[PDB]
C-alpha cells in the first residue's frame, strides 16, 4: 500500500520487465501492472528503488490503472530518457 516515487534515466531502456493488464492479469482478480524482472546494471537497478513485485500505477503523468498490457508497454516505451514512476510496494 506504500507508494514510492522513482525517477530513472534510461540506459542504452529502463531496465525492467512488466506483466499484467486487462485481459492478461498477472495476479488473479487484479489488472495491475507489476514488475517481474530487473536487469542487473540497468537504470532501475542502478537507482536501486524499484523491486520485483512493485505495482506501477503511474508513468510520468499517465496512469497504468485499467489499461491493457499493450497500452502499458506503449506508455512505458514512448518516454524520453528521463522517466518518473509512482509505484506501490507490496
Amino acid at each position: 500500500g506504500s507508494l514510492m516515487n522513482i525517477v530513472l534515466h534510461k540506459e542504452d531502456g529502463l531496465g525492467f520487465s512488466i506483466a499484467g493488464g486487462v485481459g492478461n492479469q498477472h495476479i488473479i482478480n487484479d489488472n495491475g501492472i507489476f514488475v517481474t524482472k530487473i536487469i542487473e546494471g540497468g537504470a532501475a537497478f542502478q537507482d536501486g528503488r524499484l523491486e520485483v513485485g512493485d505495482r506501477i500505477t503511474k508513468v510520468n503523468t499517465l496512469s497504468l490503472e485499467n489499461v491493457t498490457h499493450e497500452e502499458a508497454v506503449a506508455i512505458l516505451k514512448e518516454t524520453a530518457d528521463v522517466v518518473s514512476l509512482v509505484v506501490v510496494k507490496p
Binding site: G13, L14, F16, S17, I18, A19, Q25, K37, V73, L76
Partner: peptide, 6 residues
C-alpha cells in the same frame, strides 16, 4: 500471461 521488457 506475457512478460515484456521495457
Amino acid at each position: 500471461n506475457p512478460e515484456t521488457s521495457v
